Design a protein around this ligand. Structure first.
Ligand SMILES: N=C(N)c1ccc2cc(C#Cc3ccc4c(c3)CCNC4)ccc2c1
Length: 246
């Protein structure tokens, strides 16, 4: 996250921290995720497509820091890694950038909801917020494009949704951004999501309800003028999520 503020897991209890085990036993951060039910974490397929072995991943719930065992945190393995069969990448745009991770403790249990571990509600079909609506993003992603390290402490920011017609303008993304994608940015281009925030939530309060409106997917640079953050529009994927969690 570029700009914004440092936060803790109690303010974002649906936030899942996803890591990968490498050969030799070292563990590194991959992407964010969101708890949608006790056994299921939703993320972006582009985070896993190059390393599709479920046994390699570690998922934490209730974790506030990248290298700290936050009190009350829960560690899990991936029982089922589901990638979207029509996922594809263009030079900029990612298509069908959505993934599901079925989680399991070493005892074979799913998440136990607590003050720091809670689910996030899915959106309803054809009911996304209007352009100009303020929404929040969370992640352990880069603080600056030139950084190679990720922040130790979890961050958050607030951005505004951008219309499809504004996002399709020539100086923005043209025809490369589609109706299955949602644009969101800072009107002053100072805060945004960035590399490492992928797979993480775009949470919008709509009609009084906190909703998983988007999943961090792609963008040209980070916090660049006329280059919004692009998110998977979760409301389009409700039949796919239902079928793969049944
Ligand atoms: N401006 C943004 N909001 C934004 C949002 C998401 C981003 C995501 C990345 C990235 C990445 C990345 C890095 C490594 C690999 C993949 C993707 C996909 C498959 N191969 C590995 C970089 C900049 C990003 C910028």
């Amino acid at each position: 996250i570029i700009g914004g503020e440092f936060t803790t897991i109690e303010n974002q209890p649906w936030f899942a921290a996803i890591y990968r085990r490498h050969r030799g036993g070292s563990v590194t951060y991959v992407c964010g995720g969101s708890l949608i039910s006790p056994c299921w974490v939703i993320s972006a397929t582009h985070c896993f497509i190059d390393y599709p072995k479920k046994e390699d991943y570690i998922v934490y719930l209730g974790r506030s820091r990248l290298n700290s065992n936050t009190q009350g945190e829960m560690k899990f393995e991936v029982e089922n890694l589901i990638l979207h069969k029509d996922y594809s990448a263009d030079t900029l745009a990612h298509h069908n950038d959505i993934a599901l991770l079925k989680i399991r403790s070493k005892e074979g249990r799913c998440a136990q909801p607590s003050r720091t571990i809670q689910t996030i509600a899915l959106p309803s079909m054809y009911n996304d917020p209007q352009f100009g609506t303020s929404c929040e993003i969370t992640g352990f992603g880069k603080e600056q494009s030139t950084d190679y390290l990720y922040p130790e402490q979890l961050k958050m920011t607030v951005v505004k949704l951008i219309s499809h017609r504004e996002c399709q303008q020539p100086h923005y993304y043209g025809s490369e951004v589609t109706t299955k994608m949602l644009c969101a940015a800072d009107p002053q281009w100072k805060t945004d999501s960035c590399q490492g925030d992928s797979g993480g939530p775009l949470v919008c309060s709509l009609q009084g309800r906190m909703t998983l409106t988007g999943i961090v997917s792609w963008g040209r640079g980070c916090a660049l003028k006329d280059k919004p953050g692009v998110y998977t529009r979760v409301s389009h994927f409700l039949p796919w999520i239902r079928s793969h969690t049944k």
